[PDB]
Each structure stands twice: as structure tokens, then as C-alpha cells.
Amino acid sequence: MAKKLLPAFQNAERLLLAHMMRSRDVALVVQERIGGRFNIEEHRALAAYIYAFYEEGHEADPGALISRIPGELQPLASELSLLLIADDVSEQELEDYIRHVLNRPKWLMLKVKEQEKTEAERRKDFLTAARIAKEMIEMKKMLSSS
């Protein structure tokens, strides 16, 4: 990804969907704890699904909403219902992807990096923590307007 700064965190948005695809309460988490919106009609349709479903039945019915997309979110959403998440939403994962969904000037996302990066301090990613460390200074720039 030489010429790919940060187009969108669709990865977190997809797993995000997985946790919200479970309960309306979680649906609040996606909208309230993330309230994002990338350039994806299908993925966005999921985040959008819940928002509207609240007025509908107050519960993001998977079988009902999962079968409301055009064709790409159909197979994706069905699997995404819990493709990479547990009944408990996976706390570590919840904060991981939601934070990723932020993709905004929020240092808290860097905090998440603080955890993984610190793991790099002790074990590193490749050879030296300098890689993840660079990620911090990178994280500092994004959250800190320059």
C-alpha cells in the first residue's frame, strides 16, 4: 500500500457489523460508539440498517435486515453476522475495530496502537519496534492536526 494512506477502515466496519448484527443494543454501539460512514453502499447499508430498524422493530433482525441488501452485502452480511465475533462481541475486538472505524483526529485510536505497538516494544513486528514506533509518530500526526 505505497500509495494508500487511509481510504477507509472497511475492515473494522465489517466486523463492526458482525457485533451489531446481533442485538439492537449493539446497534446503538455501532451508531453511537462509531457512527461512521465510508464509500460503501452495502457496508453503509448495514450500519444504516440498524439505524432504521430501530424504528421498525427496535432490533436489527439478522434474517430480516441481512436479506435487505442488493447482492454483495447479502453473502457478506450473512457471514458477517458473526464471521469474526463472539456472543459477547469480544470486548478487545469491540474497541479494536470501532476505534479503527473512527479514522478521525482521535488520539484514542492511537491508544489502541499503544497496546499493539507496545507488544512490538517487547516482541516487535519484524526485527525492531521501530516499525510500530513509526506507527505512533504516524498516529500522533493523524490525531494531531499539522
PDB file of C-alpha atoms in Angstrom:
ATOM      1  CA  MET A   1       0.000   0.000   0.000  1.00  0.00           C
ATOM      2  CA  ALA A   2       2.624   2.521  -1.109  1.00  0.00           C
ATOM      3  CA  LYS A   3       0.025   4.934  -2.483  1.00  0.00           C
ATOM      4  CA  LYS A   4      -2.693   4.082   0.039  1.00  0.00           C
ATOM      5  CA  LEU A   5      -2.763   6.336   3.104  1.00  0.00           C
ATOM      6  CA  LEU A   6      -6.176   5.562   4.582  1.00  0.00           C
ATOM      7  CA  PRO A   7      -9.153   5.344   2.163  1.00  0.00           C
ATOM      8  CA  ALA A   8     -11.416   3.636   4.698  1.00  0.00           C
ATOM      9  CA  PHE A   9     -11.364   1.177   7.600  1.00  0.00           C
ATOM     10  CA  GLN A  10     -13.892  -1.122   5.923  1.00  0.00           C
ATOM     11  CA  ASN A  11     -12.209  -3.968   7.814  1.00  0.00           C
ATOM     12  CA  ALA A  12     -13.419  -2.696  11.181  1.00  0.00           C
ATOM     13  CA  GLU A  13     -16.731  -1.705   9.637  1.00  0.00           C
ATOM     14  CA  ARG A  14     -17.249  -5.296   8.501  1.00  0.00           C
ATOM     15  CA  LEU A  15     -16.556  -6.806  11.928  1.00  0.00           C
ATOM     16  CA  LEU A  16     -18.411  -3.874  13.488  1.00  0.00           C
ATOM     17  CA  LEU A  17     -21.396  -5.112  11.507  1.00  0.00           C
ATOM     18  CA  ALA A  18     -20.810  -8.557  12.985  1.00  0.00           C
ATOM     19  CA  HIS A  19     -21.369  -7.314  16.556  1.00  0.00           C
ATOM     20  CA  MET A  20     -24.292  -5.020  15.705  1.00  0.00           C
ATOM     21  CA  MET A  21     -25.850  -7.717  13.506  1.00  0.00           C
ATOM     22  CA  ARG A  22     -26.631  -9.405  16.822  1.00  0.00           C
ATOM     23  CA  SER A  23     -28.678  -7.015  19.002  1.00  0.00           C
ATOM     24  CA  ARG A  24     -30.318  -3.574  18.765  1.00  0.00           C
ATOM     25  CA  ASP A  25     -28.295  -2.586  21.825  1.00  0.00           C
ATOM     26  CA  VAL A  26     -25.180  -3.384  19.912  1.00  0.00           C
ATOM     27  CA  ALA A  27     -26.790  -1.480  17.072  1.00  0.00           C
ATOM     28  CA  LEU A  28     -26.527   1.531  19.357  1.00  0.00           C
ATOM     29  CA  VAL A  29     -22.830   0.767  19.808  1.00  0.00           C
ATOM     30  CA  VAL A  30     -22.186   0.902  16.086  1.00  0.00           C
ATOM     31  CA  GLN A  31     -24.103   4.156  15.546  1.00  0.00           C
ATOM     32  CA  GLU A  32     -23.187   5.803  18.872  1.00  0.00           C
ATOM     33  CA  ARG A  33     -19.748   4.281  19.534  1.00  0.00           C
ATOM     34  CA  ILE A  34     -18.735   4.687  15.883  1.00  0.00           C
ATOM     35  CA  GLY A  35     -21.377   6.457  13.782  1.00  0.00           C
ATOM     36  CA  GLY A  36     -19.129   6.175  10.746  1.00  0.00           C
ATOM     37  CA  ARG A  37     -19.803   6.180   7.010  1.00  0.00           C
ATOM     38  CA  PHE A  38     -17.401   5.142   4.246  1.00  0.00           C
ATOM     39  CA  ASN A  39     -17.800   4.991   0.462  1.00  0.00           C
ATOM     40  CA  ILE A  40     -19.578   1.627   0.601  1.00  0.00           C
ATOM     41  CA  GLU A  41     -23.281   1.338  -0.227  1.00  0.00           C
ATOM     42  CA  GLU A  42     -23.547  -2.236   1.080  1.00  0.00           C
ATOM     43  CA  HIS A  43     -21.466  -1.860   4.242  1.00  0.00           C
ATOM     44  CA  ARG A  44     -23.055   1.507   4.940  1.00  0.00           C
ATOM     45  CA  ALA A  45     -26.406  -0.166   4.319  1.00  0.00           C
ATOM     46  CA  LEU A  46     -25.658  -2.386   7.303  1.00  0.00           C
ATOM     47  CA  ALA A  47     -24.786   0.466   9.642  1.00  0.00           C
ATOM     48  CA  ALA A  48     -27.817   2.159   8.120  1.00  0.00           C
ATOM     49  CA  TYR A  49     -29.932  -0.963   8.501  1.00  0.00           C
ATOM     50  CA  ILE A  50     -29.812  -0.826  12.282  1.00  0.00           C
ATOM     51  CA  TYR A  51     -30.495   2.924  12.479  1.00  0.00           C
ATOM     52  CA  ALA A  52     -33.733   2.422  10.540  1.00  0.00           C
ATOM     53  CA  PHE A  53     -34.526  -0.982  12.052  1.00  0.00           C
ATOM     54  CA  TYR A  54     -34.800   0.782  15.425  1.00  0.00           C
ATOM     55  CA  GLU A  55     -37.999   2.476  14.296  1.00  0.00           C
ATOM     56  CA  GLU A  56     -39.053  -0.752  12.587  1.00  0.00           C
ATOM     57  CA  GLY A  57     -38.874  -3.300  15.402  1.00  0.00           C
ATOM     58  CA  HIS A  58     -36.152  -1.983  17.727  1.00  0.00           C
ATOM     59  CA  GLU A  59     -33.933  -4.931  16.815  1.00  0.00           C
ATOM     60  CA  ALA A  60     -31.588  -5.479  13.888  1.00  0.00           C
ATOM     61  CA  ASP A  61     -33.212  -8.770  12.882  1.00  0.00           C
ATOM     62  CA  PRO A  62     -30.391 -10.604  11.023  1.00  0.00           C
ATOM     63  CA  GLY A  63     -32.663 -12.753   8.889  1.00  0.00           C
ATOM     64  CA  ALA A  64     -34.765  -9.685   8.126  1.00  0.00           C
ATOM     65  CA  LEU A  65     -32.106  -6.999   7.596  1.00  0.00           C
ATOM     66  CA  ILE A  66     -29.319  -9.312   6.343  1.00  0.00           C
ATOM     67  CA  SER A  67     -31.662 -10.121   3.460  1.00  0.00           C
ATOM     68  CA  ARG A  68     -32.310  -6.474   2.558  1.00  0.00           C
ATOM     69  CA  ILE A  69     -29.134  -5.586   0.634  1.00  0.00           C
ATOM     70  CA  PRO A  70     -28.583  -5.686  -3.167  1.00  0.00           C
ATOM     71  CA  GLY A  71     -26.210  -8.622  -3.596  1.00  0.00           C
ATOM     72  CA  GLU A  72     -22.723  -8.000  -2.172  1.00  0.00           C
ATOM     73  CA  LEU A  73     -23.768  -7.407   1.434  1.00  0.00           C
ATOM     74  CA  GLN A  74     -26.105 -10.390   1.095  1.00  0.00           C
ATOM     75  CA  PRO A  75     -23.341 -13.049   1.220  1.00  0.00           C
ATOM     76  CA  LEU A  76     -21.054 -10.763   3.219  1.00  0.00           C
ATOM     77  CA  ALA A  77     -23.614  -9.754   5.851  1.00  0.00           C
ATOM     78  CA  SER A  78     -24.895 -13.312   6.256  1.00  0.00           C
ATOM     79  CA  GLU A  79     -21.375 -14.454   7.084  1.00  0.00           C
ATOM     80  CA  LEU A  80     -20.627 -11.163   8.852  1.00  0.00           C
ATOM     81  CA  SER A  81     -23.492 -11.814  11.286  1.00  0.00           C
ATOM     82  CA  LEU A  82     -20.689 -13.317  13.344  1.00  0.00           C
ATOM     83  CA  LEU A  83     -17.866 -14.054  10.927  1.00  0.00           C
ATOM     84  CA  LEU A  84     -15.317 -12.795  13.417  1.00  0.00           C
ATOM     85  CA  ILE A  85     -17.046 -12.115  16.722  1.00  0.00           C
ATOM     86  CA  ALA A  86     -18.446 -13.909  19.772  1.00  0.00           C
ATOM     87  CA  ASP A  87     -21.799 -13.800  21.567  1.00  0.00           C
ATOM     88  CA  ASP A  88     -20.137 -11.309  23.914  1.00  0.00           C
ATOM     89  CA  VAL A  89     -18.969  -9.208  20.943  1.00  0.00           C
ATOM     90  CA  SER A  90     -15.379  -9.773  22.077  1.00  0.00           C
ATOM     91  CA  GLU A  91     -14.506  -6.705  24.177  1.00  0.00           C
ATOM     92  CA  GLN A  92     -10.924  -6.465  22.912  1.00  0.00           C
ATOM     93  CA  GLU A  93     -12.254  -6.685  19.368  1.00  0.00           C
ATOM     94  CA  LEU A  94     -15.104  -4.261  20.047  1.00  0.00           C
ATOM     95  CA  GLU A  95     -12.739  -1.447  20.984  1.00  0.00           C
ATOM     96  CA  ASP A  96     -10.264  -2.531  18.299  1.00  0.00           C
ATOM     97  CA  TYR A  97     -12.411  -2.226  15.198  1.00  0.00           C
ATOM     98  CA  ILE A  98     -14.723   0.527  16.466  1.00  0.00           C
ATOM     99  CA  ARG A  99     -11.608   2.583  17.170  1.00  0.00           C
ATOM    100  CA  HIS A 100     -10.451   1.694  13.662  1.00  0.00           C
ATOM    101  CA  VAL A 101     -13.810   2.808  12.260  1.00  0.00           C
ATOM    102  CA  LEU A 102     -13.142   6.248  13.753  1.00  0.00           C
ATOM    103  CA  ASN A 103     -10.454   7.059  11.168  1.00  0.00           C
ATOM    104  CA  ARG A 104     -10.704  10.599  12.540  1.00  0.00           C
ATOM    105  CA  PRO A 105      -8.500  13.004  14.572  1.00  0.00           C
ATOM    106  CA  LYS A 106      -8.939  10.930  17.736  1.00  0.00           C
ATOM    107  CA  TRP A 107      -5.838  10.021  19.738  1.00  0.00           C
ATOM    108  CA  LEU A 108      -7.848   7.253  21.413  1.00  0.00           C
ATOM    109  CA  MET A 109      -7.232   5.283  18.218  1.00  0.00           C
ATOM    110  CA  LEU A 110      -3.529   5.772  18.882  1.00  0.00           C
ATOM    111  CA  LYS A 111      -4.118   4.377  22.367  1.00  0.00           C
ATOM    112  CA  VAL A 112      -5.243   1.172  20.697  1.00  0.00           C
ATOM    113  CA  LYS A 113      -1.999   1.362  18.763  1.00  0.00           C
ATOM    114  CA  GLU A 114      -0.273   1.884  22.106  1.00  0.00           C
ATOM    115  CA  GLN A 115      -1.347  -1.593  23.080  1.00  0.00           C
ATOM    116  CA  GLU A 116      -0.350  -3.388  19.874  1.00  0.00           C
ATOM    117  CA  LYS A 117       2.704  -1.191  19.460  1.00  0.00           C
ATOM    118  CA  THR A 118       3.827  -1.887  22.994  1.00  0.00           C
ATOM    119  CA  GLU A 119       3.602  -5.547  22.049  1.00  0.00           C
ATOM    120  CA  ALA A 120       6.067  -4.514  19.369  1.00  0.00           C
ATOM    121  CA  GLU A 121       8.284  -2.982  22.035  1.00  0.00           C
ATOM    122  CA  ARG A 122       8.688  -6.376  23.704  1.00  0.00           C
ATOM    123  CA  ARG A 123       8.483  -8.609  20.598  1.00  0.00           C
ATOM    124  CA  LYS A 124       8.259  -6.160  17.663  1.00  0.00           C
ATOM    125  CA  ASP A 125       6.617  -6.830  14.299  1.00  0.00           C
ATOM    126  CA  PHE A 126       9.573  -7.648  12.048  1.00  0.00           C
ATOM    127  CA  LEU A 127      13.015  -7.004  13.541  1.00  0.00           C
ATOM    128  CA  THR A 128      12.758  -3.818  15.602  1.00  0.00           C
ATOM    129  CA  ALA A 129       9.873  -1.979  17.269  1.00  0.00           C
ATOM    130  CA  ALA A 130      10.884   0.981  15.085  1.00  0.00           C
ATOM    131  CA  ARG A 131       8.170  -0.125  12.654  1.00  0.00           C
ATOM    132  CA  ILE A 132       5.338   0.082  15.155  1.00  0.00           C
ATOM    133  CA  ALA A 133       7.062   3.067  16.760  1.00  0.00           C
ATOM    134  CA  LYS A 134       6.840   4.835  13.418  1.00  0.00           C
ATOM    135  CA  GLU A 135       3.154   3.982  13.604  1.00  0.00           C
ATOM    136  CA  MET A 136       2.932   6.064  16.799  1.00  0.00           C
ATOM    137  CA  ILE A 137       4.529   9.185  15.368  1.00  0.00           C
ATOM    138  CA  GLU A 138       2.157   8.444  12.500  1.00  0.00           C
ATOM    139  CA  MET A 139      -0.724   8.122  14.936  1.00  0.00           C
ATOM    140  CA  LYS A 140       0.352  11.368  16.599  1.00  0.00           C
ATOM    141  CA  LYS A 141       0.167  13.201  13.272  1.00  0.00           C
ATOM    142  CA  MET A 142      -3.318  11.950  12.393  1.00  0.00           C
ATOM    143  CA  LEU A 143      -4.850  12.795  15.776  1.00  0.00           C
ATOM    144  CA  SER A 144      -2.756  15.967  15.992  1.00  0.00           C
ATOM    145  CA  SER A 145      -3.564  18.386  13.166  1.00  0.00           C
ATOM    146  CA  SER A 146      -0.440  19.651  11.399  1.00  0.00           C
TER     147      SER A 146
END
